[PDB]
Amino acid sequence: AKHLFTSESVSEGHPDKIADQISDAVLDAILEQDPKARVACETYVKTGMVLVGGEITTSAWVDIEEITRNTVREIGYVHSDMGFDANSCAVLSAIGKQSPDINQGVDRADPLEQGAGDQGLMFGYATNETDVLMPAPITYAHRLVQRQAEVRKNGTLPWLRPDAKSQVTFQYDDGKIVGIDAVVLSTQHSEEIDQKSLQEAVMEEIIKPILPAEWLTSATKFFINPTGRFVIGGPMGDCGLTGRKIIVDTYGGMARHGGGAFSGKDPSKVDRSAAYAARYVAKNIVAAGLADRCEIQVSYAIGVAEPTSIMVETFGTEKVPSEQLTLLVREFFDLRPYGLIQMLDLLHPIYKETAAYGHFGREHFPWEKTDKAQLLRDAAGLKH
Amino acid sequence: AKHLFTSESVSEGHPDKIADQISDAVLDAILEQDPKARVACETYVKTGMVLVGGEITTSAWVDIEEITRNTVREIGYVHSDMGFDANSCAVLSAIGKQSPDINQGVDRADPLEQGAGDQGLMFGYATNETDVLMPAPITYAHRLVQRQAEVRKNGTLPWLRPDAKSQVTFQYDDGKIVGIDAVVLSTQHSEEIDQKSLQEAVMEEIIKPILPAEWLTSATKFFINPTGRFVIGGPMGDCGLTGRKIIVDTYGGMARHGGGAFSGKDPSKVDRSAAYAARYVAKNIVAAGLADRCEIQVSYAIGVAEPTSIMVETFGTEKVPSEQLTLLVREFFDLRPYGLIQMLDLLHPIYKETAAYGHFGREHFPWEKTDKAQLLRDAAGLK
Amino acid sequence: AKHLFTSESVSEGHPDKIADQISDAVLDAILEQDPKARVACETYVKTGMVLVGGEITTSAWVDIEEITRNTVREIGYVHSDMGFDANSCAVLSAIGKQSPDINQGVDRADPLEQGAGDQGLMFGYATNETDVLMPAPITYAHRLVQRQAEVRKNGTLPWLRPDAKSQVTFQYDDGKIVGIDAVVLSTQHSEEIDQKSLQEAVMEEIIKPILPAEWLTSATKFFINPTGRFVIGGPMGDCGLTGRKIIVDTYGGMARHGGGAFSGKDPSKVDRSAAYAARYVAKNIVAAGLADRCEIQVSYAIGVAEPTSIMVETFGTEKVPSEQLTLLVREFFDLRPYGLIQMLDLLHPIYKETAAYGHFGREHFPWEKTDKAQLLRDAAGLKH
Amino acid sequence: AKHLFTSESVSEGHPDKIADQISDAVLDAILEQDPKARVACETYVKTGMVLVGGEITTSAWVDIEEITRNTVREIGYVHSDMGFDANSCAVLSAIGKQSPDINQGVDRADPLEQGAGDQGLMFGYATNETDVLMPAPITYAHRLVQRQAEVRKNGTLPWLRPDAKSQVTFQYDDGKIVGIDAVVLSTQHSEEIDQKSLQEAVMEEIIKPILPAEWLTSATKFFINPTGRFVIGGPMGDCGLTGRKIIVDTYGGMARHGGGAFSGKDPSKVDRSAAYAARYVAKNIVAAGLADRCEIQVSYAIGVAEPTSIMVETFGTEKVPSEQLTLLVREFFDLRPYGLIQMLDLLHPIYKETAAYGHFGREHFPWEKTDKAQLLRDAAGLKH
Amino acid sequence: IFTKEPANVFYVLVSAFRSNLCDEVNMSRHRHMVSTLRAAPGLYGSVESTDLTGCYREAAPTEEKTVRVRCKDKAQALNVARLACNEWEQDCVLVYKSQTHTAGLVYAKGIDGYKAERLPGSFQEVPKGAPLQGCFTIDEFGRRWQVQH
Amino acid sequence: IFTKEPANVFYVLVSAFRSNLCDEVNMSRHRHMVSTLRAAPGLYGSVESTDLTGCYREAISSAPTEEKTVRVRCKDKAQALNVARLACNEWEQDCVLVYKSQTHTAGLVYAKGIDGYKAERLPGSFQEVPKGAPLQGCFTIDEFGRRWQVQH
Amino acid sequence: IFTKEPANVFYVLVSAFRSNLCDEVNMSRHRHMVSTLRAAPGLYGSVESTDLTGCYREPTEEKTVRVRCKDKAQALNVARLACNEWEQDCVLVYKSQTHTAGLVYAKGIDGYKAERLPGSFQEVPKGAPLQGCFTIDEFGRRWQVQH
């Protein structure tokens, strides 16, 4: 029957997402400079300071501080009142180690056979609830935050300030979405605005234009900056750790996630590669329509070319037996780490965009392409 | 149907869990010295550097440095050549401090009516699979790594060293464990021991104990330190960030999770407290037998006493109207933050034990206690 | 579920079955003389007159009355008191024989291309209830009357006379044979015998050895010549006609039936051969595990070799999609009449045995062969 | 859920139905003379001879010859070239009369209480697909053949001759009617008419006015005398029996059948009466709306007043538990033979009407009245 | 459900005449248009039956005297019917093939109003449970059009 | 589904205009009316795309017929919508289909005249054909069967 | 289920010593023999818990002993040959994690029998107690099979 479901998305003005943006900005830099790099970088966000630490394996030379300050500038933490400034803040670098020696030494084993980077497990989820196969609520929350940031940047609300968070609660009755139960929005605001103007403005420029008027109801409730005094935002407001905001990037708790932070890790790292892969394949699946939605779990042991475990789940939404389904999975896609790499060719510095507002749910991301579905189309016959 | 499932559990030796134990020990010490304080701290782990920082509205006064040193000591990283020596550990503290007494003297308002710290959603999952009312796989990997930890501490395999991970794959038939497809173990060790002797020894003193015989067959596939080189490990091995091992702390990914790390968070905040409360109600529900496996999504708004949204899910394993079930939940339980604080009395310095090896599935923990279940079953009706 | 289902069979001693036996014995001898012949013969049976008439094209030379009397003798009506005797009864051969067409048009050009002899429709049914792939009650009833005749022949109860009718009512829970509710057995008996001993000995020598003692309960009711007098049986009491008892021949009433009388019909005639092929493909589909209980309707427009319509019905027990199943049907079996002929080798002098006690469910019959089933088991490996 | 279904009918001009007509006309004659009689007459039909014989107990006095000649003449086989004559056909009555005194002598018995005259079993069906509560295809096919007979009689196409047969194939989606796939109509025709113009004429005067063009597609195929020559028609070309088209009499094979040839059976004969009762009660059931399509079966043990089995079948289209349903059934209806007699009042010379064009679906026949249905509906409280 | 009792492909359609709010003069108006159509059946090619009552719930059901007419010509006769409704301003009419008893309604104004609705689910049914639709009943037989779900 | 990719609260609605059997003069009529609609984008409040066609049994035995149609993206729940209605009224057009872009489903309004609102809401689905069965109210744009769906 | 707690590869098994013929003297010999078992921990190779009491409604109730032996069959062998010596034939065994196993009826030094179709064991569902009760720690427990 009817039951609430709730998902949230943070602004790209949030400290944790700030750290992720920083990390994958460094990643895009190093990657542009080298396709074959092996990088895992982490970013700590604190009031007066920002730190980056980790390891890089390549030939590239990279200025960390300017990457960081560019990033903050994009976000806009450029004045004391905000509690954080791109320029004056302290950047702390500990990554280095710049050791391309080990992998440059000898290269004769086939890449598709080169064992998994490190042990791990991950998931890829897909559905038909929306166009983009993502779950509805997480997508709506992403729309909310990105619209907020857009208003801040274009200047329609000059007094807006980068940090913000959003949470939405829908009534899932019989699977379909009848309407929103409630929406809660928190924003960083300049000191000038008073509360009432703020609530009015945000209900105006954000809530209505983004949400379906039908889902918008009187019974639906709206909580906007319940404290309302949020001129303090971002780091001085709260701590920031890379990948700490792990779920928001994903399906927003709609499905089970593996447990490896996307940002600050390169396609060499098995986590993102495999996760992109799982999302990609499940997307091709639901695009075929074999199941309204599918969950995919894949588990790698370190030094293993092949997935230790591959589980498919349709939640009964399957139109065909699940076993030949599994067969098709293992056939049509090479699940080897470098193999799915070649399948998706991630070696392009693009992740600075996927830094925030969902790592799936955007077309330009390559994994979101779903050609092979047609091949899948042929492999299975008619439903039932 | 039949399929495979996998989960993962880490040793205390892994850097992420290291930072987690660190921050949680901090929180337990401060809680001991002061119940009502507010705590938000994070820990970072570099090669020889450990960082701790956050806002702690407390009257308390304790050196974070010596606490960290003693904790790492207990972990045993007391030798640089391991990759980390507790004596040498570079300690960085930036912990924000503030006076909470002034705030509480200002508020003068009922606890229950006081709103949630921050907006956030969280889950609680339970099931009748385990008689500890957990999922099987994460529990097995937990017993695995902790048995390794124990057999190291007691020095039975002294050359063994702390850092270790376990990734385990079961075969589920029609939702029933028929056998373990594969078990993968990695562990830190001295250098002198051979890889093969190591695999043999660990299969003996780790694998055989925690794994039951029947699921083990020839078909079961074992992969132990496939690199074979895990002297190099620990912090120098890899940087550990507080909470990054969230899922493997929660449910092994058997069920959903919201994304708020447990460590460094007093019961006051919504994240950890609500997580406990959800697992608690779910466990009591299953103990009332209302559903065989159940997941709870509870969602709070910042500053708000009322929890924005409440959802129960039974995967059809319910025995009653799910809406009636929700009604019963709201009856028996005050989902307010202060409400669950009351119902579970989390105001006690205990979380150093929830540091590592499973937050849920250890009876001494308050939320794991299942009292209202019976009364819930009494509220239930037919069955 | 709780529902009681009944079927009913007859002995060979009953008039109608006598008619059919006569007709098909004629057919058997004739077709033996010439396989290529065409025969449509019907037999009326009255108090003492056996009438036989129909259309026959062949070059054969057969006495009607000879086979007639011999058949009646084999049945056993040899004495006045039975109410009938081949030595006594007068035989009326009304068959008009015209030449076989020797023209080259009906020749080699193509048997498969040769159009259907006559319009019509027929049914096949198969189930997974039994090893014989036929509904239970009809099978048990047939086995009952068979036990009866076998007694009357081996000499166990000589005072039995050939006419006998049996009827069984099974209980049904969840469509699983649970309990036999009622048993009605009327039989033809000599004058000397007495009613009570008859009831007893009949219950003993026939009912027990054929019904599973379990479904026999205390509450199980019995009716055995409840009229208490069946001295004068056979045709004298009542008219017997060709093929009228068509139900008992097919399915005992579990399945819907087309209406073509099988007895006394040459194989080239569409009805009998078509229905046999129907039962054939039904058995093959059921044996291939593709369904639990399947029904087949096939319809032929006179002069058109191609079946007008082919319906396959799985009652939800299809393990593969029903239409893909239908495709399978059209592919694996040629359904043109002469296609059936080649498929089954029907042009063989067999059916005299097939006159009575079940037109299906007796193995050595060609349509009953489950050979093709494996291929069908092959053509689809999906499980649901 | 897409399947082709097929049904089959014959004009009265067909020899078999002719035989049935003969029997029932005899029956109506006798019943007119005396209601209480017992009649079991059968009629064989050869090329030039019609044999009539049966067991009859009555005080009646009825020429078989006059009746037969009248009936045949009314049908129209009044000429040699037709293939059969009413005036020169040979009439043979094998009728053996029993004494009505055995009927008068039995007394002091509840007429109701008396056991059934003869064991049996039968299925009456009903479906709300059509307002006659009959399977659509067989009803349309009756309308077809009847229209043909009508155009023969009214003189519009006098070259048309009585014998004619019909075969229709409908599409079915979701169990629902969509289109007619195929239609086959073959008739006897006078020599003067051609093939082609006959095709045209049958297309117009019969097919068009009777078939809903919506069901008629260009893709829908047509067959009219596919052999292209049917001058020799009637019994001359092909033998005919009494009760050898038991299917088209009842349901066109949509529903499983008991197997009692109705014609020539007196009401007191259990088969005809009981089957009437079955269709009657099933029609009342569906009319009350207690279910959408119900098949009733009833079985009777010889010498018993109470049936052995009364099984209702709803195909899930029930609106109430089949068990409460069965209780209701045995509540309102007394399936005692004389009971169903008094319920239906069969004691009237009316069956010459039910000769052809289906025993069911025709209003004035009392068993089609649906008054009981209201008290049925009100018996169980149903609100949907 | 396929009635199959009335004639085959012969068409049947209904009309109201009571479109505007002129209750009594509306009644006479209807009657006069009835006289018009019935007086010249040939052009209409139709058999009239004026007893019926047409109830449009239209969110407060309005009931207007209505007439069902059987039109033989697959378009021509019903076309004449459409014309009549047009001149008498009657907005739109229902048509259906009796055997199938299913057809959408056609709107028809101007010279040749050829505007027949899509979604032609069904018609001539009485579920007797939910009256929240157009009451179109003759001899207390509420004949409502439906769709499939 | 919830087609998030398309624009938000906008209503996308279709129009046919080819009402009477006027085979090619009706097509010219169509082109004319499309031009007229494009002529006043403001009050029409819509962008037009003319690829779509619509296909019905039409309950008049002759044959299912199809008409060229146009999709227009009105921003106004009513204003540009009402303009579309008044247009089809002018063009003797009986009914129109409007579905709200984000939900991707909303019922039809067979309102005409000057100031009439006949707001039906179908069973809440639209533009959704998996190429299974084309029986229903027939649509195609960009060779996509895209028609509403009734609940089951 | 699976009880998750006890050492895995360990073998916990329940046995009754009292026959049906008498009760109190069967109970005396019960405590005697079970104490003999208890006293020797090497052959019986197990720990004992005497709380458990069984019923077989077939409620024939008797005092029972739960012994946990490491040896997969060996101390189990001592237990089963011991029940042989006490003429008792009914003895249940189960492995901790599975928390079930079939039933063994093994007298004779090598006479060794194995059950067929074991589903589960040592849980009561509170629904239908027709099965053999096994009540310990104020909790009933029975064995099971899939349906």
Author numbering:
A (entry chain F), C (entry chain B), D (entry chain C): 1 to 384
B (entry chain G): 1 to 383
E (entry chain J): 2 to 60, 64 to 153
F (entry chain L): 2 to 153
G (entry chain K): 2 to 59, 65 to 153
Q: What does the publication say?
A:
Using single-particle cryoelectron microscopy (cryo-EM) and biochemical assays, we demonstrate that SAMase performs its function by not only degrading SAM but also by interacting with and efficiently inhibiting the host’s methionine S-adenosyltransferase (MAT), the enzyme that produces SAM. E. coli MAT is a dihedral homotetramer (comprised of dimers of dimers) that catalyzes the condensation of ATP and methionine to produce SAM.
Specifically, SAMase triggers open-ended head-to-tail assembly of E. coli MAT into an unusual linear filamentous structure in which adjacent MAT tetramers are joined by two SAMase dimers. A SAMase monomer is an α/β protein composed of nine antiparallel β-strands forming a barrel-like structure and two helixes positioned outside the barrel. Two T3 SAMase monomers interact along ∼1,000-Å2 isologous interfaces to form a C2-dimer. The MAT-SAMase interface is smaller and occupies ∼600 to 700Å2. However, 6 out of the 21 interface-forming residues, Asp132, Val 133, Ile 178, Ile 211, Ala 214, and Trp 26, are present only in E. coli or in other closely related enteric bacteria.
